[PDB]
Amino acid sequence: NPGLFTPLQLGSLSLPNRVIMAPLTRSRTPDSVPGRLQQIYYGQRASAGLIISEATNISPTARGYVYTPGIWTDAQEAGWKGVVEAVHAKGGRIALQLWHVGRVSHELVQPDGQQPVAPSALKAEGAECFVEFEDGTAGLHPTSTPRALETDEIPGIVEDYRQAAQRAKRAGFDMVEVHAANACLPNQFLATGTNRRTDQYGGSIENRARFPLEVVDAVAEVFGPERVGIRLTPFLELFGLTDDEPEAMAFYLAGELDRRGLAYLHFNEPDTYPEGFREQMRQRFKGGLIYCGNYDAGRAQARLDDNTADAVAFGRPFIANPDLPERFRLGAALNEPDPSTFYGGAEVGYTDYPFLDNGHDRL
C-alpha cells in the first residue's frame, strides 16, 4: 500500500519518492552542450524521485530538432557530467533519455544535408520538425521523406546507442532510458504503419521488436539491465505513426523485457487502453511500472492503489513546479505552466518558476 512518498527500489536504484520528472525537451542548448543553466534547472528539480532527462540525440543523424543536446562528443559528455554532478549534490538521481528521431527529421537539420533514415521510406504525414534555415532563423518545418535503412546499417545504429550509454555511464548518470515512444525511431520499427520491411527487422511481431531489443541489450551491457529503462507508447498515434497490433506488441515486449530483468517500463498514455491492459502489464512485467499523462496527486495515488503502477511521471507540472513532490505532500496549489516558453530561449520560463515559501527557508 505505497503512497507517493514511499521509497521505491527501481531496478538497483533506490528512489525516495514516486513522483518522477518526465523527459521534457526544452531546446535550451544551442550548441548541443549542456551547461550551467541546465545545472540550475535540473538541480532545482532534484527532489524528484527520479529525473528522466530531456530526449538526447545519440548521433548527428539522430537529430530532428535544433538546439537540443547530444551525447556523441567529448564536449557534450563534459557538459552532461557537470549537470549530473549538480543533480547529485542536490540529492537527486538522473536518467539519460537516448533519442533518435528516425523519419521525424529533414535534410536541413541532418549533417551535410543527408536524407533522414527510418525502417521504411514513408514520410510522416503532417509532421513538423524544428529546423534552422540558411538565414539563421528557426522554426517548425515539414519533415521530409526518409530512406529505408539497409539491413547492414542497423548494427551501426545499435552501436550509436551503445556508445551513447558508455558516455552516459562515464558522465555519472544513474540510469538510461531508451526512447522507444512518441513515434521516434525505435517506435517506427515497432509499429505496423511505419515498418514495411521484409528483412528480419519487419513483418512479424518478433521481427519488428528485433532492433529495439538489440538497442536495449546493447545499453544494458553498459549499465546492467537493473539500471535501464524503456519508454513505450502503445496505442498512441503521433507524427503520422499508426499500428494495427499495439496490444500484442506491448505484451510481447513486456515478456521479453521481463526475461531481461529490466528496471522499468515507462508508458506515456494515449490519454484508450482496453480494460484489463494495465492488469496484464503488471502480471507480465515484474519490474518497475511507470505511467505518465495528465496525472495529478489523486490520479497517481489511484494507480498505486490499484497495483497497476509503481510510480508516476509528471511533465508539464514539473516544468512549472521545481518542488512538485513537496506540493503534493502539502496539497499546495501549483504554478501554472507557460507553454510559450516550453521551448527555446534561456532562463525565463525555465529556472524562474518559484518554489514554495515555507516561511523558514532563506536565500
Ligand X SMILES: Cc1cc2nc3c(=O)[nH]c(=O)nc-3n(C[C@H](O)[C@H](O)[C@H](O)COP(=O)(O)O)c2cc1C
CB of 343 to ligand X, least distance (A): 6
Number of alpha helices (DSSP H) and beta strands (DSSP E) in the chain: 10, 14
Chain positions 125 to 184 lying near ligand X, rule: CB under 6 A, are 179, 181-182
147: helix, strand or coil: strand
Residue 46 within binding range of a copy of itself, rule CB under 8 A:
yes
Which of 27, 145, 166, 280 touches ligand TXD (CB under 6 A)? 27
State yes or no: 166 annotated in a binding site: no
AA identity, residue 143: T
d(CA 306, CA 272): 18
DSSP per-residue letters across 100-124? --TTS--TTTSGGGPPPEESSS---
Total residues binding ligand X (CB under 6 A): 21
d(CA 288, CA 286): 7
Residue 61 within binding range of ligand TXD, rule CB under 6 A:
no
Nearer to a copy of itself, 252 or 353 (CB): 353
State yes or no: 55 annotated in a binding site: yes
Chain positions 143 to 202 lying near a copy of itself, rule: CB under 8 A, are 172, 174
Nearer to ligand TXD, 55 or 117 (CB): 55
d(CA 155, CA 150): 10
Residue 189 within binding range of ligand TXD, rule CB under 6 A:
no
d(CA 112, CA 11): 40
Range 159-175 burial, b when 16+ CB lie within 10 A, else e: ebbbebbbbbbebebbb
Residue 221 binds what, of ligand TXD, a copy of itself, ligand X, none (CB under 5 to 8 Å, by partner type)?
none
Neighbours of 272 (CB within 10 A): 8
d(CA 13, CA 240): 36
Nearest 10 degrees: Cα torsion 184, 98, 175, 151: 80
The interface mask with ligand TXD, positions 199-238, x = CB under 6 A, is ---------------------------------------x
CB of 26 to ligand X, least distance (A): 7
Residue 209 binds what, of ligand TXD, ligand X, a copy of itself, none (CB under 5 to 8 Å, by partner type)?
none
Burial class (CB in 10 A: 0-12, 13-18, 19+), 153: exposed
Total residues binding a copy of itself (CB under 8 A): 47
Please give the annotated binding residues for FMN, written as ranges. 23, 25, 55, 97, 182, 231, 268, 292, 294, 315-316
Q: Contact positions toward ligand TXD, by CB under 6 A? A: 25, 27, 55, 65, 67-68, 130, 140, 182, 184, 238, 343-344
Q: Contact positions toward a copy of itself, by CB under 8 A? A: 4-7, 9, 12-14, 16-17, 19, 40, 43-44, 46-49, 85-93, 172, 174, 323, 325-326, 328-329, 347, 351-358, 360-363
